[PDB]
């Protein structure tokens, strides 16, 4: 099977915390740069965070210092630790290969997975 499968969303209060996961299947995970994007109501898809195969990371300006991306290669799993959550973070979050993120933002392709919903209210 070839899939990206997100879980871990939920409904938290402002200031709260969630950890999202994505389990990847169908390819050698450790050598691929992975990331997260999100889609807020009425908006397009937008980058959240990247982690390259070497463990270098990047974050959208609006989440820096609050979110932390990590990966467990032995479990084919990507994580996004969300702390200090804000109402503006409400969105469906999706996992992607890093090389797919710009095409997803542009609407050229869609996320592979069904995503997971985060509501901050």
Residue numbers in the entry: 2 to 122
Provide the authors' own sentences about this structure as they appear in the paper:
To map the functional epitope of xhNup93-Nb4i, we solved its structure in complex with the α-solenoid domain of xNup93 (residues 168–820) and xNup93-Nb2t by X-ray crystallography and cryo-EM. The tracking nanobody xNup93-Nb2t binds to a C-terminal region of the Xenopus Nup93 α-solenoid, it is frog-specific and did not inhibit NPC assembly. The presented approach relies on a high species specificity of the used tracking nanobodies, which can indeed be explained by the corresponding nanobody-target structures. Similarly, our newly solved cryo-EM structure shows that xNup93-Nb2t fits well into a pocket at the C-terminus of Xenopus Nup93, but clashes with the backbone of human Nup93 at the same protein region.
Nucleocytoplasmic transport proceeds through NE-embedded nuclear pore complexes. Using a selection strategy against conserved epitopes, we obtained anti-Nup93, Nup98, and Nup155 nanobodies that block Nup–Nup interfaces and arrest NPC assembly.
